[PDB]
Structure formats: structure tokens, C-alpha cells
Amino acid sequence: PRAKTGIVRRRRHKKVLKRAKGFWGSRSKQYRNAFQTLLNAATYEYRDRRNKKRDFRRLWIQRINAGARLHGMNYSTFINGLKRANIDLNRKVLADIAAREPEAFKALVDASRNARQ
Amino acid sequence: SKTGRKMYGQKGTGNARHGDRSVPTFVGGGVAFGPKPRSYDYTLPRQVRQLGLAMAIASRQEGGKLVAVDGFDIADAKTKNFISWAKQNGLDGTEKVLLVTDDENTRRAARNVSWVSVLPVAGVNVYDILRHDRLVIDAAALEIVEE
Amino acid sequence: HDLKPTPGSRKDRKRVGRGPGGTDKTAGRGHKGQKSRSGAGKGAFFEGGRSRLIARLPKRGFNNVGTTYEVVKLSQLQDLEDTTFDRDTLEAYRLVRRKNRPVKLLASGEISRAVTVHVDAASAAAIKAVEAAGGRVVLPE
RNA sequence: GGUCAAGAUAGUAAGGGUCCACGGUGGAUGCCCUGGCGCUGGAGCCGAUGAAGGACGCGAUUACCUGCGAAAAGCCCCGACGAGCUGGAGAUACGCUUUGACUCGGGGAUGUCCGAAUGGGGAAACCCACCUCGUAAGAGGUAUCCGCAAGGAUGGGAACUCAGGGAACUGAAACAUCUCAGUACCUGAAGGAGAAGAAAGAGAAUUCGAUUCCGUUAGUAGCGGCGAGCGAACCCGGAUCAGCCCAAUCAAGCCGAAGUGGCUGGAAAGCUACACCUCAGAAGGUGAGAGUCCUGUAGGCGAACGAGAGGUCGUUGUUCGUGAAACGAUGACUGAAUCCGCGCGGACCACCGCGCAAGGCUAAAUACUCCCAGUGACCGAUAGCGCAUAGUACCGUGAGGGAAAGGUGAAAAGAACCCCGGGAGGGGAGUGAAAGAGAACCUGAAACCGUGGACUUACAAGCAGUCAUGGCACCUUAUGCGUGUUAUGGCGUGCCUAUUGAAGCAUGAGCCGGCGACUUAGACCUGACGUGCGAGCUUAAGUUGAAAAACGGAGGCGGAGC
RNA sequence: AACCGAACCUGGAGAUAGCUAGUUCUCCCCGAAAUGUAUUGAGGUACAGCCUCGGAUGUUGACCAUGUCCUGUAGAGCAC
RNA sequence: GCGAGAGCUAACUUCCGUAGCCGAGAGGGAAACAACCCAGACCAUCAGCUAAGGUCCCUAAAUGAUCGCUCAGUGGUUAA
RNA sequence: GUAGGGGAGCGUUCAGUCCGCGGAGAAGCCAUACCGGAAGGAGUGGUGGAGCCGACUGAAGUGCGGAUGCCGGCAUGAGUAACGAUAAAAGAAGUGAGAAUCUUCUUCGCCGUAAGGACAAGGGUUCCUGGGGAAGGGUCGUCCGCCCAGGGAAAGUCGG
RNA sequence: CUUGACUGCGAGACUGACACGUCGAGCAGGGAGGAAACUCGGGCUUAGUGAACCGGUGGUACCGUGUGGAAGGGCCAUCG
Ligand SMILES: [Mg+2]
Ligand SMILES: [Mg+2]
Ligand SMILES: [Mg+2]
Ligand SMILES: [Mg+2]
Ligand SMILES: [Mg+2]
Ligand SMILES: [Mg+2]
Ligand SMILES: [Mg+2]
Ligand SMILES: [Mg+2]
Ligand SMILES: [Mg+2]
Ligand SMILES: [Mg+2]
Ligand SMILES: [Mg+2]
Ligand SMILES: [Mg+2]
Ligand SMILES: [Mg+2]
Ligand SMILES: [Mg+2]
Ligand SMILES: [Mg+2]
Ligand SMILES: [Mg+2]
Ligand SMILES: [Mg+2]
Ligand SMILES: [Mg+2]
Ligand SMILES: [Mg+2]
Ligand SMILES: [Mg+2]
Ligand SMILES: [Mg+2]
Ligand SMILES: [Mg+2]
Ligand SMILES: [Mg+2]
Ligand SMILES: [Mg+2]
Ligand SMILES: [Mg+2]
Ligand SMILES: [Mg+2]
Ligand SMILES: [Mg+2]
Ligand SMILES: [Mg+2]
Ligand SMILES: [Mg+2]
Ligand SMILES: [Mg+2]
Ligand SMILES: [Mg+2]
Ligand SMILES: [Mg+2]
Ligand SMILES: [Mg+2]
Ligand SMILES: [Mg+2]
Ligand SMILES: [Mg+2]
Ligand SMILES: [Mg+2]
Ligand SMILES: [Mg+2]
Ligand SMILES: [Mg+2]
Ligand SMILES: [Mg+2]
Ligand SMILES: [Mg+2]
Ligand SMILES: [Mg+2]
Ligand SMILES: [Mg+2]
Ligand SMILES: [Mg+2]
Ligand SMILES: [Mg+2]
Ligand SMILES: [Mg+2]
Ligand SMILES: [Mg+2]
Ligand SMILES: [Mg+2]
Ligand SMILES: [Mg+2]
Ligand SMILES: [Mg+2]
Ligand SMILES: [Mg+2]
Ligand SMILES: [Mg+2]
Ligand SMILES: [Mg+2]
Ligand SMILES: [Mg+2]
Ligand SMILES: [Mg+2]
Ligand SMILES: [Mg+2]
Ligand SMILES: [Mg+2]
Ligand SMILES: [Mg+2]
Ligand SMILES: [Mg+2]
Ligand SMILES: [Mg+2]
Ligand SMILES: [Mg+2]
Ligand SMILES: [Mg+2]
Ligand SMILES: [Mg+2]
Ligand SMILES: [Mg+2]
Ligand SMILES: [Mg+2]
Ligand SMILES: [Mg+2]
Ligand SMILES: [Mg+2]
Ligand SMILES: [Mg+2]
Ligand SMILES: [Mg+2]
């Protein structure tokens, strides 16, 4: 017996192509360039899962430093200050305190510069 | 049927290189690796054919869908009478039945029934049997197919 | 339809090619080379282009078929045959089927009970041990 | 509020982008068959009585095809069927037919011209004659070779057969003997087969008994730049049997069982309720899937015609390559015995065995497959034959090469008539179950071209992605883990191949769709897994049976090595 | 007969091609080599070396310490 | 890199020995960068500590402390 | 983790068997936010109009992006080059659904040992009449060497 | 003084991918020199070499195609 392709190739193809909507020009309409674009997309996805974990830490840190310095303290000195007084806060959380709740962040500042004295 | 003549020049043309249009990368060419007429018939070891057949009958015994039979009773070669005979023996119609006998007319009575398949003498075999639900053995052949 | 073959009876074959699963690109064959290529040939006794081992080795002696003797043991005839005796057409029906060759009897392991044997030849220690147990050995005329 | 001032931000899109909607293009995909493919089995020649193959004709209308041949889609008789017919062609008209048409079977009559062509010629299918009869019309004859005559031959035929002649690539990892291989090809002769055949044999048992074919012996014995590699036979088991004469029943055809009602549906075969035949439930057709509606099947009937010597030199054949080279086989030279004789048995001699050369025919088993029939874990429109038909169109001076091609609908009911337009095309209407089937007519993917809508883009450096967030929009696996779209930030050197090293200014690639590449074989070799038997295991050819399989021990493998 | 250091057509013929391209579905486990010698051999092949799977063994391997023997480089030295 | 020859104690040179890496290795660093430095990625996380390397702004992190040096943009490429 | 070895699977045709769907509508096609560790797999809806899914088992012409691969369709270059001798055109008039291109008139221009006339070879109805306008004509055509129909070719003396 | 520059062997190692190559105790026959223990199967050692194939020669009586012979091969030696 013989077994043509029948139906499989087009299903594969549409699969790729349908992953690829919103891609510019032929990248979203031609199979091969879709499939290709997608390989590179692979790289970018995996990488950036790790990397976004890298990025958000960064952000938190920025905000923290800011709040720190509003009340006359560097960030680094603020964080040894916190570790000294064994306050054990996430910097995600430290950021959110710093940004959202003024007086509270203030209190943590005073506690930390005390731990520094 | 494609002439073997070279179609055009090996280099030059700017085309890819080809020699013939009878080639499996060519629409309308040859199949690369097609099927040619062959055979599949080997010799399975005898003892295994025997043990098989045996084990067929055995399987259909724990059924218990064996029905050993002596003589029959179908008037003179009539299917309606096969139907009544069958019915007396619990053959409602809701099963597929293989019948093995050496009597011309009982077979000649079964056959045209949709749900009966009819086999003379030692035309028996694991396939045909295991194919069906019930087996009509008959029984005359059974005391000889032991010894 | 109920039935299934034995686990490990039938391995599905190698379909080389068919994607990066899988043996990608080169289907086992490696990269380039005469081994890579697709043609019937080398074959098997071809070393380098060199000068072959078999070609470097000394030939010894002619060739001769001669006669070969079909072996019958004592230990066979002995222990547990209970002497149905040897004759000519009896051995066959028991177990030493050949034809076209003459029969020989050889020492094997042990002798005890006496029997009458019909061969075409036998070893010294075999006739000696078959007589020393009371049995006679028959060579043809 | 007004003027001025400083600052910040918005909208408009010429065109683009992403997504959505709706189309066009195009012909993938699915379904299908009117066409192929293989295997098995059958059947096997035609021709001077004019073949195979053609040319020109024949029609109420005739370009193609089919059929035919101036007696021209046909004429005569016989047989069958029994109502339609007047070819594919579907189209108008003429008409034929129960005094038996049409079709089927079987014989005859006619059968132009060319083609072995054969009166002579010739650039095939055209030109020119001669003779006998005849009133003319017309008819018949006029080739060569064997033969006294009668009669035979010439030509054609895919494969198969034998014979005369006889390659190379290639393998030997170079090459010359060798191998490819007595293969390809050329020529010849012939048949449905042909060849071969009735032992101056094979052989080693004082065994066998015409030949061919299958298994096996056996990759054994041997051959060989003893390299590559080449490779028997005897025995044994089968298929089929045969040895005689000369020289002193199938081909037309007919008969042939059994069902209705309600329901869905455009339509009944499907559903459902009860019902029947079956030596018949194989199959196809019927508005969808029918044992019981039609054709059929099982079974039965069935025809006037129809069919069944030795030598020496030079060489070569089989495993036979100068080898110690027997034996056959001839080209050259030469040339014996005829029975107490002759020929062989692998140099050669004796002995022991087998044999009667120089004279012929022979069916059967075997090969093939143009043609016919049945079947298929063969193909269904790039597949399968090159062809759903065509060796056509087309290309070539020629030899020769050589395509694509498929689908309304159950049924033509093939859309009267109205609207715009010269028309093409379309919108209505009408038919239809559906024109979401209208003749550019099954489905109708993708590339590719457009219309419309959403959010968007005119300070911007970019492998076009990816991550994060904000804006807008949307709510049928959807109010969240959202879907679309976007702004801005972070991050980011296409794929493949080939490489020490690829974004590379290294290779390939316009795009999408289809076709497209590790397979088959042997009864080979060697391992892994599994199964059946197990000191044993197994059959092959074949025989019979065959909607299955069983027999078949010849052989092969273990059994002891050196 | 629009390309002649040997025309063209068909066939042998799927010539040969140690050469270049190409080689298609997914996940999981281990995971190399580009060294040696030999080759009318050098971009090819044979056998080792290295990888994997399976069956055997059963700590035999690894590192590091202790013991013991071998060495002629670094340095240095000038006795040849 | 270290050890040598060859070479001009030239070569992103050539040929050997030896370790490591690339090859077949992604991740951070060295602006960029197969090889160097840190380090071997089974998957998920808007979690914590560290390595090399870094903490003025682009750019995560001390415009840190104390004792000095250089004033030449030396820093941010060579010699007698 | 490259060559390579090993392991478990996904999907495709055909085949046997079982289940079973289908005009209250199959396969195929189309959309989709659901499912599975991946090949992949379902739900619903739109299309379509007659066949087909699932399960186990068997056999393969069984899975594509590459091969300057093969057949086919459609893009880019682009409304770009070009429209085939620089002998040359103008007006009126007619026709016609439509005219720069057709017909008539008047002129103009170009060949004139030719760009005129007659044979041969070759071609094969291309000639004449009447009609036509899809394509062929490098535009356009109402026209034509194109398409349809019907006519036309005459030998004792020319050539055989 | 002599022919150990010897036949029949070879425990066990070195060494090479293979084929090769190298060293060698000890047993037998049978010898040389020594008064003897003993030593000798070439040279202080490491180069002075050529695998197969086909063939020459001396021995050998293994095979020899109906049997007995002989051609021819085989074996050990050996030359090209
Ligand atoms: Mg981290
Ligand atoms: Mg075709
Ligand atoms: Mg694998
Ligand atoms: Mg690829
Ligand atoms: Mg490659
Ligand atoms: Mg606009
Ligand atoms: Mg005709
Ligand atoms: Mg007539
Ligand atoms: Mg009649
Ligand atoms: Mg009729
Ligand atoms: Mg004639
Ligand atoms: Mg040659
Ligand atoms: Mg060669
Ligand atoms: Mg002939
Ligand atoms: Mg001769
Ligand atoms: Mg010869
Ligand atoms: Mg002779
Ligand atoms: Mg199709
Ligand atoms: Mg109309
Ligand atoms: Mg738009
Ligand atoms: Mg600016
Ligand atoms: Mg802007
Ligand atoms: Mg390079
Ligand atoms: Mg590499
Ligand atoms: Mg580039
Ligand atoms: Mg490039
Ligand atoms: Mg290159
Ligand atoms: Mg290019
Ligand atoms: Mg086993
Ligand atoms: Mg020329
Ligand atoms: Mg080729
Ligand atoms: Mg060939
Ligand atoms: Mg690993
Ligand atoms: Mg290489
Ligand atoms: Mg190896
Ligand atoms: Mg140890
Ligand atoms: Mg020194
Ligand atoms: Mg270098
Ligand atoms: Mg790296
Ligand atoms: Mg890096
Ligand atoms: Mg960086
Ligand atoms: Mg570098
Ligand atoms: Mg540090
Ligand atoms: Mg900072
Ligand atoms: Mg891994
Ligand atoms: Mg099925
Ligand atoms: Mg199907
Ligand atoms: Mg492609
Ligand atoms: Mg090109
Ligand atoms: Mg193309
Ligand atoms: Mg323009
Ligand atoms: Mg331009
Ligand atoms: Mg321009
Ligand atoms: Mg222009
Ligand atoms: Mg012009
Ligand atoms: Mg002009
Ligand atoms: Mg008018
Ligand atoms: Mg003009
Ligand atoms: Mg006028
Ligand atoms: Mg003229
Ligand atoms: Mg004419
Ligand atoms: Mg035009
Ligand atoms: Mg008009
Ligand atoms: Mg005209
Ligand atoms: Mg006249
Ligand atoms: Mg040789
Ligand atoms: Mg000799
Ligand atoms: Mg001799």
C-alpha cells in the first residue's frame, strides 16, 4: 500500500502559523519563516524566564535605594541595618513598603540606623 | 517510459543538474523504493500449528462454547430446518457460529444463514474458529482428532 | 482479535532519517567518506588498499576429503539403552542417522553390561573394553 | 472670566502595520469511478484464398472516432431474444419493425487502392501496358525460387526458443590475463512452444538405464595475475514418461424463492412494528444503507450451425585460464581396424569395469504472455500505463522524443419571461431539497490580489523576536491564568550546510501547495529478543485439498576432536 | 543540420562516482574522536585507541598517604 | 599557559610534549569578543546568599572610611 | 551536549476483529482562550453533502524547509523596459454601440534594376463573395493573411 | 684442542594495531673444550634486511580421480 501525506503536513503547518500571529510581514504568513522566527523565539522565551527574575530584583532594589535616601540613608547601609536588627524582609516587600506606605518605611529606617549605631 | 537521453547540459544552463526524467525526484518518474510482487508465505513449525489448533478448541471449551454433535437432523437439505435444529440447540441468532461436518447436506442447509460459516472435514484452523463465537465441532471428528 | 504477541517478540525497525528525534540528517552514516557513500561495495576482506593478512600467510598442504567416520559412543549404547542391539537398521531407529559414511565406535566414558555391536570400524580401547565386559565387536569382511 | 507669559499634552494619515470580518485567485485536501497495475489461470499463431499496417472512400446533415468497402454504419441463410430500433453523437428530418426488426451466436457473398506486392514503373497508396473471354460494361491472367506435375516458399508476430556474429562501461579500489559476459546488441530460422532425446553415457555399487524441468547435493569437488572472484556433477527426493524406423465438454440463451404498514426525510433501502424465502445473505443498479423492488446469484434447462574414427599444428566447450590435460569440437595437413574387432573410463601401460560412433523422427513434464477471465493488507487523477486514453498536440530533416488532461443534478426538470449591456457578464423570476448545484457547474486548503472594521503609526537606527508594564478594545473552550491590539523600557548576530571557527560580505533558497531519499531479495552469514519442540530439531521441491490446511525425511543443523 | 580534439538518436544503463549536495515525528539515558602504526597512502580505507548496549564477574578502578626500587632533566660543575 | 625545536627568542606562524577550555558549553565578567576569568543550565517562582567582576550618571551596588602618591588627563597602549 | 549507541512512545494509509456513528448530516476544509511530558488530542460553532471515528492486532510507497531538487500556481522587479528601421502625415466625408487605426474624397510624403511586374522552389484555400469579432494583430479596431459559410481553379498545341 | 655457526623442543617474559621482532631457563638425542665445577644451540651488545605468490634443488613415501603403478601435488630442508 502507499501512504500519501494527505493531511498531516498542513496540520503541522497551520500549528506553527497559528502560533505566529501578530508577527510582521512574512514572519506570520509564510510557514518557513514562521517556523524559523519561532526557533529564535524559543531562545528568547527560555532566556527571559530566568532573566525577568533578574530584572524584577533590580527594580525592587532601585525603589528601595530611593526610599532609603529620602530619609538620609544609603541603601547598602540600610540593608545591613535591617540584617543587624534581624528584620527579615523580601526586597519585593521592602520595595512595596517603600513605595506604598511612607511612615512604615520610615519606621524601618529608624530601626535600621539604630541597628547601625 | 522515459528516454534515458540526457535532458540538457551538466553545467551551463544555470539550472540544477539532471540526467533523466525517469527519476524518483521527478513527478511522473519511478518510485524510489516501491513494492514489487513478493511473497509472505513461510513455514511455521508443525508442532506449533498443532498446539495452536488444539489451544483454539481448548479456549472455546472453557467458554463453554463447544458443542459436540452426532448425526444431525435437518430433513433433506433445507435451510429452514437448519434454523429449527439450531434453535433447539440454543442457537438464538445472537452469535456467530462455525460448523464443521463431513455431511454434504447439513452444510448445504447452514451456509446461506448470515451468522453461520461452514467448513468441511479438516478445513479447520485457528483463524476461522477464533473468528466466530460458537463452534459446532461436530464430534465424529473429535474422537479421531484425539486418536 | 483478543490476542496479543509476546512482550519482546517484535521490535519495530529502525527508520533512519525522519527528523531530529531521532537520527537527524546523516542516518548513522557519519560525515563524508567512502563509508558514507551509497554504493554496493568494499567489501569485507578489504584492508587499507594495503596487502592482506590472508595474502601474507603461508599456505600449507593440499586438500583432501577422504573418508569420515560417523561417531558412536559407548556411553550412549551403555547406560540406558537396555540393549535393543545394533545390527544395521536398528541403530538408525534409535539415534545415529547419517548415511553415505562408514560407522566408527569410540571409547567415550564407561562399559559394564555386554552387547553385540555392528560397525565398520572402532578404536583399539573400544574393542578391548567392549570384550572385557563380555560383548563382541563386528567388522565386515 | 479677559490680555500677556511659562510649561505640558491632544487629534487629524498621503500611505503603512497587526488582528477581525467578507470576497477573488488557485486547485491542495476528502469522497468517487469511466483507467490502470501486478499475480493466477486460461488461450496461442496470421499470410499469394493477399496478412499484419495503411490510403481513399461509404452518411439526409459527417470534421473526429467507430463499422464497412462502389453489394460500402452494411447484403444472404441458419440459430437465439421478443419490442423496440434508426453507431460513440446526446441533433433535426426521413423512416424501419410481431410476415419477428435491433442486439447476441454461426456460417457464407461482396471486399476499391497501397503494403511480402507479385504485369512493368514508381518519390507506398500512384503512372504505363500486354494476353484470353465478352456485345460493351466487365472478368480473369501476366514476379521470383523448389518441383514433371500437384503443391510448397517469400511477409508479419511483445515476450519465450534454438543458431551464425558478438561489445564496453564496470570489478579487480591503477591495469594487460581475468571479470563484467556468451550478458547488451545485430542477423537467421521456427513454433504455439521450442530445444533436447532412445547411451561408442553417467559412473565405481561388476550400480543406474532417452531428454527437459524443480528440490538437493553445495558455495562441497574443483577453477583462478591461486588475486578479484568463478563454480559443477554423482547419489537421493520429485514433475512427466515412449520409444520407432533404415544403409549390405465449452461458444448465444432461457427458467429461476421470499414484505407490507406506519415514522424521519426532497427522496427510503434507513428507523419501527409484525412478516416471509434461502441448494439463492456473491455483486451491482434503485432520489441515503434493500436477502424478499430490478438485474442477478444456488439450481436446472439449453441449440440447427460452432468448438474440442585416430593423429599432428592452431583453438575452444563443461569447475577446465597449458596445467601432468584426459574427452568432445572443428580450420589446416594426414588418414586404421569391422567381432580374437572397435570407443571410453582425467597423462601414460597392464588388468579389471562401462559401452556398439560415423544414418533419421518423436508427444508428455519446461519457457513466455500481445490477447481473455478471476482475484488483490496494489493505485484512485503529480497516483496508476506515457493516455480516465494519445503515441495525439507539440519538438526534431531524421532516427526519435512526447504532454495536461476527470466530477452540475436523483433526474435536464440545462433557467420561458423581465431588468442594465453591442456583447460579455450579471440581478430577478421559475425549476430544484439545495442554484450556499447554472453549465468557467463536488469539496475548494495555502501562496498571492482586494473591500470594510478594530487598535495604531509622520524625531525614527530595526534578524523584527522575546520579557515587563501602561493604553485602548472585546467577551461562545471568555470576566482572567484572559483574547486582539498597541505605547514605552530591558534584552536579542535568520535557517541550513560545511567547519578549527558562521549573523557572516562563505553554500543553498522568490513564495505556498503537492511529488521527493536507508528498501527489497536469498530459503545466505552472524548476534539480541521471543516462541515451539528438546538430546534431539526441522523439512524442500512436490502431492492432495483449497471460502482452510494436511501430507511429503530427500535433504539440512546438533551429535568429537586432532 | 545554431556549442565537433570525435555528430546525433536509442540501447548496455539505476555504467562508475574513495567526490559535493540532500536525508523528513517526539521525549528519555549515556556519549566520543580529529591520537598510533600501515597503506600507488596522505580530505580514502584496515587494526588498535576512545563511545554505547547486553551478559559475566565482584572493589579488582579512582584519588591520596606509607614503603621500596628506576631516572640524568632543572640547576650546577669543570674531573674527561 | 608552561616545555622545546624550526622561524627573526616574527606571525590569529609551523611541528612535538603537557594542563585547561572551544570543539560538542548555554549562564555572569572581560564595551563588543569560540578560546581568557567565574562557573557545568531536569522544569516552575514578581524569593534568599555568593563567584569572577563591580558600586559618580548611561548601568545593579559606598560620590565608603583612614594614611599616603601623581597634576601629567599620566590614568587611557613602545624603547635606547 | 555534536557524530554514535540505547529506551518509551506520537501520527499516517491499508488489513483483520471488536465497538459504533452518519441526511435531525460523514470524511475533508475553517475559527478557537480547553487537554496531555512531547510527537499530539478533544469540546463547541461555520463549511460541506456521503461516507467515517475509537480499540486491539498485522503489513508499509508512512511523517520534509532545504538537495542551483520535480510538477504546479502565484508574487518581486512595475504600471517600470519596450511596442521591431526616422519613408510622414493632414482635413473632410461615411460607417458604427463604440473609430488617431475601417471605408471614400482631396492633398501631402517614400520606393521606382524597386519597395514595380512575371516564373521556379516552397506553402496549402491563405484567392473571390457574404458575414463575424472571443482569442491571434505588440495600441485600437466596426478591419485583417484571423473565425463561419458558400463559391472559385477548365488545355490535342504551355510544363510533366 | 676444535665445528654448539647442532637436531627434536620450549617453562616464562620484553615488545608491536596486526604481522613481526627480541631475551630465555630447563628436558631429550648427541657431540666440543676442560683434571674437573662447568660452558657451548655463533660474533660485547644494538644495523648487515624482503611477507605471500609462482618456480629450482636434496630428502620424504602423506594424496594419487575403477585397482596396481607412474605424471602431478603434499610434507621437511632449501635456493631465486
Ligand atoms: Mg539569580
Ligand atoms: Mg499520470
Ligand atoms: Mg534511535
Ligand atoms: Mg535538514
Ligand atoms: Mg553532509
Ligand atoms: Mg487615503
Ligand atoms: Mg475514417
Ligand atoms: Mg462490385
Ligand atoms: Mg434472422
Ligand atoms: Mg433485445
Ligand atoms: Mg506492382
Ligand atoms: Mg576500462
Ligand atoms: Mg579497475
Ligand atoms: Mg521470421
Ligand atoms: Mg589441441
Ligand atoms: Mg577454454
Ligand atoms: Mg579427441
Ligand atoms: Mg483531486
Ligand atoms: Mg445572458
Ligand atoms: Mg484596512
Ligand atoms: Mg530630536
Ligand atoms: Mg511620533
Ligand atoms: Mg575554512
Ligand atoms: Mg566538527
Ligand atoms: Mg548578508
Ligand atoms: Mg549568506
Ligand atoms: Mg564551498
Ligand atoms: Mg542567489
Ligand atoms: Mg533463544
Ligand atoms: Mg555546427
Ligand atoms: Mg547514476
Ligand atoms: Mg551494466
Ligand atoms: Mg552527561
Ligand atoms: Mg572529514
Ligand atoms: Mg574500529
Ligand atoms: Mg587500588
Ligand atoms: Mg643548564
Ligand atoms: Mg597557528
Ligand atoms: Mg560560553
Ligand atoms: Mg559568554
Ligand atoms: Mg555584555
Ligand atoms: Mg578570538
Ligand atoms: Mg569580591
Ligand atoms: Mg545606581
Ligand atoms: Mg542530556
Ligand atoms: Mg480499521
Ligand atoms: Mg478514508
Ligand atoms: Mg521547497
Ligand atoms: Mg539562479
Ligand atoms: Mg517553477
Ligand atoms: Mg507612469
Ligand atoms: Mg526602476
Ligand atoms: Mg522611465
Ligand atoms: Mg519609453
Ligand atoms: Mg511599427
Ligand atoms: Mg514617429
Ligand atoms: Mg448614424
Ligand atoms: Mg498609422
Ligand atoms: Mg465624399
Ligand atoms: Mg517585387
Ligand atoms: Mg495546387
Ligand atoms: Mg488588441
Ligand atoms: Mg457592425
Ligand atoms: Mg482576403
Ligand atoms: Mg482550342
Ligand atoms: Mg599473485
Ligand atoms: Mg620435489
Ligand atoms: Mg614425486
Swiss-Prot record, chain A:
UniProt-listed CDD domains: Ribosomal_L20 (cd07026)
HAMAP family hit by this protein: Ribosomal_bL20 (MF_00382)
Protein name (record): Large ribosomal subunit protein bL20
GO molecular function: rRNA binding; structural constituent of ribosome
Subunit structure: Part of the 50S ribosomal subunit. Contacts proteins L13 and L21.
Keyword set, alphabetical order: Ribonucleoprotein, Ribosomal protein, RNA-binding, rRNA-binding
A GO cellular component entry from the record: cytosolic large ribosomal subunit
Gene source species: Deinococcus radiodurans (strain ATCC 13939 / DSM 20539 / JCM 16871 / CCUG 27074 / LMG 4051 / NBRC 15346 / NCIMB 9279 / VKM B-1422 / R1)
Family named by the database record: Belongs to the bacterial ribosomal protein bL20 family.
Purpose of the protein: Binds directly to 23S rRNA, probably serving to organize its structure.
Encoding gene per record: rplT
Gene Ontology terms describing biological process: ribosomal large subunit assembly; translation
Swiss-Prot record, chain B:
GO cellular component terms given for this protein: ribonucleoprotein complex; ribosome
Keyword Hydrolase found: no
Record key words, sorted: Ribonucleoprotein, Ribosomal protein, RNA-binding, rRNA-binding
A GO MF label: structural constituent of ribosome
Record GO biological process: translation
Keyword RNA-binding among record annotations: yes
Self-association state and partner proteins as the record states: Part of the 50S ribosomal subunit. Contacts proteins L15 and L34.
Family classification: Belongs to the universal ribosomal protein uL4 family.
Protein role: One of the primary rRNA binding proteins, this protein initially binds near the 5'-end of the 23S rRNA. It is important during the early stages of 50S assembly.
Protein name: Large ribosomal subunit protein uL4
Organism this protein belongs to: Deinococcus radiodurans (strain ATCC 13939 / DSM 20539 / JCM 16871 / CCUG 27074 / LMG 4051 / NBRC 15346 / NCIMB 9279 / VKM B-1422 / R1)
Gene: rplD
Full-sequence portion shown in this chain: 52 to 198 of 205
From Swiss-Prot, chain C:
Cellular component, GO, one term: cytosolic large ribosomal subunit
Region of interest (Disordered), residue spans: 1-45
Gene Ontology BP, a term: translation
SUPFAM superfamilies, per database record: Ribosomal proteins L15p and L18e (SSF52080)
Protein name, UniProt field: Large ribosomal subunit protein uL15
Keywords, ordered alphabetically: Ribonucleoprotein, Ribosomal protein, RNA-binding, rRNA-binding
HAMAP family hit by this protein: Ribosomal_uL15
Organism: Deinococcus radiodurans (strain ATCC 13939 / DSM 20539 / JCM 16871 / CCUG 27074 / LMG 4051 / NBRC 15346 / NCIMB 9279 / VKM B-1422 / R1)
Family to which the UniProt record says this protein belongs: Belongs to the universal ribosomal protein uL15 family.
Function recorded in the entry: Binds to the 23S rRNA.
